[PDB]
Scaffold this active site. Structure first.
Site, PDB file in Angstrom:
ATOM      1  N   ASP A 149      -2.955  14.721  14.463  1.00  0.00           N
ATOM      2  CA  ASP A 149      -2.974  14.773  12.767  1.00  0.00           C
ATOM      3  C   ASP A 149      -4.197  14.436  12.044  1.00  0.00           C
ATOM      4  OD1 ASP A 149      -1.418  14.856  10.583  1.00  0.00           O
ATOM      5  OD2 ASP A 149      -0.582  12.946  10.701  1.00  0.00           O
ATOM      6  N   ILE A 164       1.020  -0.979  -0.024  1.00  0.00           N
ATOM      7  CA  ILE A 164       0.030  -0.054  -0.095  1.00  0.00           C
ATOM      8  C   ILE A 164       0.903   1.441  -0.026  1.00  0.00           C
ATOM      9  CG2 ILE A 164      -1.658   1.437   1.194  1.00  0.00           C
ATOM     10  CD1 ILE A 164      -2.640  -1.304   0.001  1.00  0.00           C
ATOM     11  N   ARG A 224       4.554   7.530   8.148  1.00  0.00           N
ATOM     12  CA  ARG A 224       5.673   8.376   8.924  1.00  0.00           C
ATOM     13  C   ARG A 224       6.867   7.334   9.244  1.00  0.00           C
ATOM     14  NH1 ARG A 224       4.181  13.462  10.044  1.00  0.00           N
ATOM     15  NH2 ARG A 224       1.960  14.022   9.888  1.00  0.00           N
ATOM     16  N   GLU A 238       5.552   0.620   6.989  1.00  0.00           N
ATOM     17  CA  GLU A 238       5.143   0.286   5.662  1.00  0.00           C
ATOM     18  C   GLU A 238       3.634  -0.406   5.776  1.00  0.00           C
ATOM     19  OE1 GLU A 238       7.999  -1.143   1.966  1.00  0.00           O
ATOM     20  OE2 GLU A 238       7.881  -2.222   3.763  1.00  0.00           O
TER      21      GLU A 238
HETATM   22  F1  LIG Z   1      -2.148  -0.970   8.467  1.00  0.00           F
HETATM   23  C1  LIG Z   1      -2.631  -0.841   9.782  1.00  0.00           C
HETATM   24  C2  LIG Z   1      -2.279  -1.921  10.783  1.00  0.00           C
HETATM   25  C3  LIG Z   1      -2.528  -1.535  12.157  1.00  0.00           C
HETATM   26  C4  LIG Z   1      -2.891  -0.220  12.482  1.00  0.00           C
HETATM   27 CL1  LIG Z   1      -3.093   0.051  14.185  1.00  0.00          CL
HETATM   28  C5  LIG Z   1      -2.962   0.559  11.526  1.00  0.00           C
HETATM   29  C6  LIG Z   1      -2.794   0.527  10.268  1.00  0.00           C
HETATM   30  C7  LIG Z   1      -2.943   1.615   9.355  1.00  0.00           C
HETATM   31  C8  LIG Z   1      -3.245   1.335   7.956  1.00  0.00           C
HETATM   32  C9  LIG Z   1      -3.620   2.409   7.297  1.00  0.00           C
HETATM   33  N1  LIG Z   1      -4.089   2.234   5.855  1.00  0.00           N
HETATM   34  C10 LIG Z   1      -5.144   1.580   5.662  1.00  0.00           C
HETATM   35  C11 LIG Z   1      -5.854   0.919   6.345  1.00  0.00           C
HETATM   36  C12 LIG Z   1      -7.042   0.129   5.916  1.00  0.00           C
HETATM   37  N2  LIG Z   1      -7.516  -0.157   4.603  1.00  0.00           N
HETATM   38  C13 LIG Z   1      -6.879   0.501   3.736  1.00  0.00           C
HETATM   39  C14 LIG Z   1      -6.849   0.715   2.227  1.00  0.00           C
HETATM   40  N3  LIG Z   1      -5.778   1.443   1.845  1.00  0.00           N
HETATM   41  C15 LIG Z   1      -5.451   1.801   0.663  1.00  0.00           C
HETATM   42  C16 LIG Z   1      -4.546   2.997   0.519  1.00  0.00           C
HETATM   43  C17 LIG Z   1      -4.134   3.318  -1.059  1.00  0.00           C
HETATM   44  C18 LIG Z   1      -3.197   4.525  -1.017  1.00  0.00           C
HETATM   45  N4  LIG Z   1      -3.882   5.638  -0.516  1.00  0.00           N
HETATM   46  C19 LIG Z   1      -4.383   5.728   0.879  1.00  0.00           C
HETATM   47  C20 LIG Z   1      -5.199   4.301   0.893  1.00  0.00           C
HETATM   48  N5  LIG Z   1      -5.063   1.980   3.027  1.00  0.00           N
HETATM   49  C21 LIG Z   1      -5.558   1.272   4.208  1.00  0.00           C
HETATM   50  C22 LIG Z   1      -3.336   3.729   7.506  1.00  0.00           C
HETATM   51  C23 LIG Z   1      -2.635   3.855   8.933  1.00  0.00           C
HETATM   52  N6  LIG Z   1      -2.552   3.019   9.535  1.00  0.00           N
END
Ligand SMILES: Fc1ccc(Cl)cc1-c1cc(Nc2ccnc3cn(CC4CCNCC4)nc23)ccn1
Length: 299
Positions: free
Chosen positions: A134, A12, A16, A19
């Site tokens: 944030d 994805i 900060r 990954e």
């Molecule tokens: F992964 C984790 C595991 C554990 C914890 Cl405590 C936090 C995170 C976490 C995930 C985050 N991002 C996302 C979470 C759910 N579904 C998503 C679908 N996408 C596609 C992107 C394409 C490109 N543009 C942005 C959107 N991203 C997503 C973000 C922050 N923390």
């Protein structure tokens, strides 16, 4: 039992400190955030936040677990959560326009999650008041039912109302500069007062509401997607650049002329202005905002 049984499928992107991956757990899609060992402090702090008592809410990202995975050469620090196929609110608003009903849904669920974050819950399994720090469209996700849930809690601060202390010693100015409240930009924020962090979340949420409202299409007319202050600062603005715009010139995102032709947009614009006050003490609360959009939603 967790990282052991998860297969990563697709990158994805880098946050900060982490990954992010799309993974599979028991044939189900999950999001996985992976840190190196030298990022132990970020991973732990973030795991601590998401394991807060009574945190789970429909409009907060669903945390599954923290784990470690040794591959044979090095150790990965894992966080695991729900996967949301639409991605960020930012992604969503770039792809689509919304209806009036759809605008209200995105803003109400956002307001609802934030209000839950901010709410101290009492009792044995009590939940401390939490401020995000944030908040922005890229740190909010859109679920399959068209409602939002708030993500990226790793920079949050939790408040123990017992001893009247916050759980970390806050170095100033951690969030995204574009969404920093004026009191954050000019460094006048009183951080011995927890309400100050709540009021800064609200300012940022106002900006997010503006991002949404632009994409509300009534009879074919709408604005294209921009970030707040797109017309005033470069893409990666410095703090000095933001401060001159927000604090010195005292400018906010422009409210389009057409938003007076509809009641939903008129209410949303009124809300934004009451999030944008230079003085944080006079801004609306997330709970107040929730109530207003609730009553609006039933018309
Ligand atoms: F992964 C984790 C595991 C554990 C914890 Cl405590 C936090 C995170 C976490 C995930 C985050 N991002 C996302 C979470 C759910 N579904 C998503 C679908 N996408 C596609 C992107 C394409 C490109 N543009 C942005 C959107 N991203 C997503 C973000 C922050 N923390």
């Amino acid at each position: 039992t967790i990282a052991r049984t998860i297969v990563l499928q697709e990158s994805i992107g880098k946050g900060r400190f982490g990954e992010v991956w799309r993974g599979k757990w028991r044939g189900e899609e999950v999001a996985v955030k992976i840190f190196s060992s030298r990022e132990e402090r970020s991973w732990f702090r973030e795991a601590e936040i998401y394991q807060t008592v009574m945190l789970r809410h429909e409009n907060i990202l669903g945390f599954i677990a923290a784990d470690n995975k040794d591959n044979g050469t090095w150790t990965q620090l894992w966080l695991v959560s729900d996967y949301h196929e639409h991605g960020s609110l930012f992604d969503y608003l770039n792809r689509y326009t919304v209806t009036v009903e759809g605008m209200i849904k995105l803003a109400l669920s956002t307001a609802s999650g934030l209000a839950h974050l901010h709410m101290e819950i009492v009792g044995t399994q009590g939940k401390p008041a939490i401020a995000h720090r944030d908040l922005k469209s890229k740190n909010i996700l859109v679920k399959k039912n068209g409602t939002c849930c708030i993500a990226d809690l790793g920079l949050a601060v939790r408040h123990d109302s017992a001893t009247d202390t916050i759980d970390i010693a806050p170095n100033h100015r951690v969030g995204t500069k574009r969404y920093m409240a004026p009191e954050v930009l000019d460094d006048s924020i009183n951080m011995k007062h927890f309400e100050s962090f709540k009021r800064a979340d609200i300012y940022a949420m106002g900006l997010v509401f503006w991002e949404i409202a632009r994409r509300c299409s009534i009879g074919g007319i709408h604005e294209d997607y921009q970030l707040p202050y797109y017309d005033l600062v470069p893409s990666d603005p410095s703090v000095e650049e933001m401060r001159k715009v927000v604090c010195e010139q005292k400018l906010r995102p422009n409210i389009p002329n057409r938003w007076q032709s509809c009641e939903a947009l008129r209410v949303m614009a009124k809300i934004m202005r009451e999030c944008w006050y230079a003085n944080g003490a006079a801004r609306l609360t997330a709970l107040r905002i929730k109530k207003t959009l609730s009553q609006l939603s039933q018309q």
